[PDB]
Amino acid sequence: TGDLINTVRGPIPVSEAGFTLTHEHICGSSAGFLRAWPEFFGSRKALAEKAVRGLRHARAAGVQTIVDVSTFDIGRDVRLLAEVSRAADVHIVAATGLWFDPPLSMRMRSVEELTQFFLREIQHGIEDTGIRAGIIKVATTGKATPFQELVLKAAARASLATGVPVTTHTSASQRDGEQQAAIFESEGLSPSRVCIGHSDDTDDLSYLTGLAARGYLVGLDRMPYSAIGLEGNASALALFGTRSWQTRALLIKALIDRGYKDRILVSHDWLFGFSSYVTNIMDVMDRINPDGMAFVPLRVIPFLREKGVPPETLAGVTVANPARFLSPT
Amino acid sequence: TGDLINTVRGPIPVSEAGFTLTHEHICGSSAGFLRAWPEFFGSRKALAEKAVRGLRHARAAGVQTIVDVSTFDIGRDVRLLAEVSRAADVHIVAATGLWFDPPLSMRMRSVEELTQFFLREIQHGIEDTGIRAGIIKVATTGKATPFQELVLKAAARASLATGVPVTTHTSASQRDGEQQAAIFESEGLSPSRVCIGHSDDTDDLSYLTGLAARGYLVGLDRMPYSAIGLEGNASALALFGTRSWQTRALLIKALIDRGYKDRILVSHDWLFGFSSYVTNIMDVMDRINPDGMAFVPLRVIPFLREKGVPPETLAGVTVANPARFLSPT
Ligand SMILES: [Co+2]
Ligand SMILES: [Co+2]
Ligand SMILES: [Co+2]
Ligand SMILES: [Co+2]
Numbered sequence: 001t002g003d004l005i006n007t008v009r010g011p012i013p014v015s016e017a018g019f020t021l022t023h024e025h026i027c028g029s030s031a032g033f034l035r036a037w038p039e040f041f042g043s044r045k046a047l048a049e050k051a052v053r054g055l056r057h058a059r060a061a062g063v064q065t066i067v068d069v070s071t072f073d074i075g076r077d078v079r080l081l082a083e084v085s086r087a088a089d090v091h092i093v094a095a096t097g098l099w100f101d102p103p104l105s106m107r108m109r110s111v112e113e114l115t116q117f118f119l120r121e122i123q124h125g126i127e128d129t130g131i132r133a134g135i136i137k138v139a140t141t142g143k144a145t146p147f148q149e150l151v152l153k154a155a156a157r158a159s160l161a162t163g164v165p166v167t168t169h170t171s172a173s174q175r176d177g178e179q180q181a182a183i184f185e186s187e188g189l190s191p192s193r194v195c196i197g198h199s200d201d202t203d204d205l206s207y208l209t210g211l212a213a214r215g216y217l218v219g220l221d222r223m224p225y226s227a228i229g230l231e232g233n234a235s236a237l238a239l240f241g242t243r244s245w246q247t248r249a250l251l252i253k254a255l256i257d258r259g260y261k262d263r264i265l266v267s268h269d270w271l272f273g274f275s276s277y278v279t280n281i282m283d284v285m286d287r288i289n290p291d292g293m294a295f296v297p298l299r300v301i302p303f304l305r306e307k308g309v310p311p312e313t314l315a316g317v318t319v320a321n322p323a324r325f326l327s328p329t
Numbered sequence: 330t331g332d333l334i335n336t337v338r339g340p341i342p343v344s345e346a347g348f349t350l351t352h353e354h355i356c357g358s359s360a361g362f363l364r365a366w367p368e369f370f371g372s373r374k375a376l377a378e379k380a381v382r383g384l385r386h387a388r389a390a391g392v393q394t395i396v397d398v399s400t401f402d403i404g405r406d407v408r409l410l411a412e413v414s415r416a417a418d419v420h421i422v423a424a425t426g427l428w429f430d431p432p433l434s435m436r437m438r439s440v441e442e443l444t445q446f447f448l449r450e451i452q453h454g455i456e457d458t459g460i461r462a463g464i465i466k467v468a469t470t471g472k473a474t475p476f477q478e479l480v481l482k483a484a485a486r487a488s489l490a491t492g493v494p495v496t497t498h499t500s501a502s503q504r505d506g507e508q509q510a511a512i513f514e515s516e517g518l519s520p521s522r523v524c525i526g527h528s529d530d531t532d533d534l535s536y537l538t539g540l541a542a543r544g545y546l547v548g549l550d551r552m553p554y555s556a557i558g559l560e561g562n563a564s565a566l567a568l569f570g571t572r573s574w575q576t577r578a579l580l581i582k583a584l585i586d587r588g589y590k591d592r593i594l595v596s597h598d599w600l601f602g603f604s605s606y607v608t609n610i611m612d613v614m615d616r617i618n619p620d621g622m623a624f625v626p627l628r629v630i631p632f633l634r635e636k637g638v639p640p641e642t643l644a645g646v647t648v649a650n651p652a653r654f655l656s657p658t
Contacts, residue, residue, distance in 0.1 A: 030432030032360030035456050036401055037446055040434075072365055075434065101433050103359030104605040105369075105404065113608065117366055127364050276433040279442065 003327045006132040007065075008082040008092045017091065018064030020322035021293060023167065023197055023221035025271035026051050026068055026084055026092070029075030031103060033275055041273045048084055051272040054292045055088035061294035065091035067267075067326070069137040069167055069197075073101045074276070078126045093326065096121035096133035096158070098151050099169060100141055101276065107147050114154035115161075122162045134326060139169035140176045144183070152180060156187035163328030166194045167219065172201035177211050191215035193329060195265055198222060200248040201241065205258075212255060212263040217325055220251050221267035223300050224289040235278045240288070249300045252317070253307055264317050265325065266300065268293055332656045335461040336394075337411040337421045346420065347393030349651035350622060352496065352526055352550035354600035355380050355397055355413055355421070358404030360432060362604055370602045377413055380601040383621045384417035390623035394420035396596075396655070398466040398496055398526075402430045403605070407455045422655065425450035425462035425487070427480050428498060429470055430605065436476050443483035444490075451491045463655060468498035469505045473512070481509060485516035492657030495523045496548065501530035506540050520544035522658060524594055527551060529577040530570065534587075541584060541592040546654055549580050550596035552629050553618040564607045569617070578629045581646070582636055593646050594654065595629065597622055 003014035027034065027047060034044065041047040058066070070076035078094055085092040096118045098106055109117070121133040136155045140148050155166045166184070170176035177196035184194055196211055197219035212218050225248070227233065227240035255264050270293045274282045289295050301314055332343035356363065356376060363373065370376040387395070399405035407423055414421040425447045427435055438446070450462040465484045469477050484495045495513070499505035506525035513523055525540055526548035541547050554577070556562065556569035584593050599622045603611045618624050630643055 030360065030434035031362070031365070032401065032404070033432065033434040036360070037434075037449065039449070072361065073432065075361070075432075103362065103402065103404075103432065104430050105359035105362040105366075108604075108606060108608070110608070120366065120368070275437075277437060279437070279439070 005093060005326045006134040008078060008085050008094050008131050012091055014323050014327050017323055019062050019318050020065040021063055021267045022067045022265045022322050023069050023219055023267035023269050024066040024293060025070050026081055027273040028271045029275045030101060031073050031075050033075045034077050040275050047273045048080060051084040052087045054272050055084060055090045058293035059088060059090050061297040063293060063297060067093045067135055069095045071095055071097045071099045071137045073099050078129050078131045093134040094126060094131060095135045095137040097137035097155055099137060100139040111150045111153045114150055115157045118154055118158035119161060122158060122164055134164060136164060136166045138166060140180060141171045142174045144179055149183060152183040153187050156184050156189040159189055159193050165325050168197045170196060170198045172198045175207050181216060195219045200251050205254060209258055212260040217265050218255060218263055219265050222269045223248050224268055224295045236284055249303050253304060253309060256309060256313060261313055261316055262321060265321055266296055266317060268295055334422060334655045335463040337407060337414050337423050337460050341420055343652050343656050346652055348391050348647050349394040350392055350596045351396045351594045351651050352398050352548055352596035352598050353395040353622060354399050355410055356602040357600045358604045359430060360402050360404050362404045363406050369604050376602045377409060380413040381416045383601050384413060384419045387622035388417060388419050390626040392622060392626060396422045396464055398424045400424055400426045400428045400466045402428050407458050407460045422463040423455060423460060424464045424466040426466035426484055428466060429468040440479045440482045443479055444486045447483055447487035448490060451487060451493055463493060465493060465495045467495060469509060470500045471503045473508055478512060481512040482516050485513050485518040488518055488522050494654050497526045499525060499527045501527045504536050510545060524548045529580050534583060538587055541589040546594050547584060547592055548594050551598045552577050553597055553624045565613055578632050582633060582638060585638060585642060590642055590645055591650060594650055595625055595646060597624055
């Protein structure tokens with residue numbers, strides 16, 4: 001009791017977060033895009049309705065909170081998040097930081113300037129809404145670009161100032177987490193404040209246990225992603241990969257079996273609209289996983305239970321770990 | 330009489346455009362940036378106040394209309410344009426199209442999809458404002474990227490459908506206008522609907538007269554840009570170049586002397602805020618040219634008059650040419 005986290009509807013007790021999906025999106029887009037071209041998604045109304053249906057389905061399956069890790073450059077629309085959170089009665093934590101599509105007005109900035117921007121979104125509010133970010137999202141896709149180095153350092157500084165955790169996009173097959181870790185530590189950030197994401201995109205347990213041993217949270221956050229059966233579709237192959245959801249889920253058990261149950265976060269990286277990729281990608285995705293953000297509780301958790309993971313351990317992964325992660329520390 | 334052009338305050342008779350600067354910016358930024366980080370500019374209020382002072386100064390010097398060629402990805406804020414247009418009593422024509430910083434949500438689009446977006450901004454309105462674009466802005470920086478090829482084709486299609494003209498950013502030293510022309514013509518666009526911009530960034534009159542002979546408008550639109558005296562400042566050198574304003578202005582006379590008076594458009598490429606480049610670039614610029622968008626009428630036009638260009642010819646360049654260009658055709 002007592003600890004608080006900021007959501008798009010305002011402050012909530014940490015203990016009310018409950019079952020929390022730590023890497024999700026209402027909409028994967030671009031800065032200004034939803035405002036400029038809402039017809040891309042049919043309409044804003046259609047997008048919101050789809051999101052509300054999806055979040056209610058997740059809620060019925062036991063999901064109480066999602067962390068929408070859409071940054072400025074993922075076209076995060078905090079008013080949209082607030083509207084759908086309210087309608088579906090599911091808490092949404094919003095993000096600051098920058099992903100891998102920053103516009104020139106961000107790319108030209110210094111570490112000091114980026115720190116001030118991240119601090120604005122955490123401490124003051126996003127845009128003119130007063131809605132405060134509860135997480136900082138950053139990204140590399142291979143070795144960090146010079147700009148990405150500044151972003152990670154600024155993320156570390158903002159986290160140190162506010163206690164808000166940092167979460168990452170990686171190219172997991174290229175083992176980005178190691179350099180990301182090196183940069184964060186150079187700034188004196190505690191590994192327990194950091195989740196190295198898309199870590200289920202690899203089966204390299206040397207890489208993953210290495211991070212977990214150092215105290216990092218390991219984000220196994222793309223559970224339903226598979227292009228098995230869709231190998232004819234090149235864009236789906238590139239995004240979803242050729243590993244089954246079962247293969248991804250086995251990593252949760254593997255980390256638990258190696259003593260790392262407290263270092264695991266599980267999610268889908270799902271969304272209800274998706275303009276930053278090929279047209280109609282959302283239709284492909286909805287076919288692969290009609291359950292959307294209910295997939296983890298409906299499929300993954302029982303799969304793990306049937307493999308012998310104790311209920312207490314599963315509750316620790318889906319409730320206690322997110323609580324500890326999100327609590328400003 | 331009769332012909333109309335859309336401005337941020339609504340429709341105006343073409344004959345009321347008067348002395349028109351055809352390539353300008355209220356603010357050079359990025360999509361969503363002004364909404365997310367207005368403190369970058371001091372405040373939105375400060376930015377608007379600066380813009381109103383600047384536009385009133387231009388108006389006092391005889392400027393009646395500017396064409397703000399900020400696209401979506403230059404962070405065009407049409408409400409800001411409308412506010413400052415109203416306060417300064419200077420007409421502002423807004424733009425659609427894409428510059429050279431499109432986010433992924435644009436870069437993934439087809440020519441058909443881009444055409445629909447440009448048509449939306451011209452025919453329906455920008456965002457939810459009902460303000461209609463009166464020009465389409467496109468860009469290359471050297472040989473066109475595959476995406477830029479689609480953008481130029483979509484610009485051509487939108488222009489053919491609406492009669493609204495197209496204007497371009499070039500790397501003038503790399504003679505981009507020739508390929509841009511080739512792409513436009515492949516779509517059946519009339520050269521008289523097109524301005525090849527930043528053409529005063531080069532002294533190559535073979536290149537420029539080649540375009541003018543084909544019927545293109547030649548945009549001599551960076552009149553006050555010079556880093557003479559600032560060679561110690563690397564970012565200023567890269568953006569402003571080492572040629573004097575007099576050297577740029579001589580190109581106006583050179584084209585007139587070669588029979589191309591009707592093919593010339595003159596502007597500053599000025600702005601009142603600038604977040605897509607180095608921090609404090611606006612302070613450097615304001616020192617180079619305290620007159621802002623009054624520089625053309627105060628310095629360039631009298632320079633030309635003193636070189637013997639007849640008043641009728643100068644009026645044809647600054648009034649008749651923009652009128653003919655902007656009139657939907
Ligand atoms: Co990602
Ligand atoms: Co994601
Ligand atoms: Co330009
Ligand atoms: Co410009």
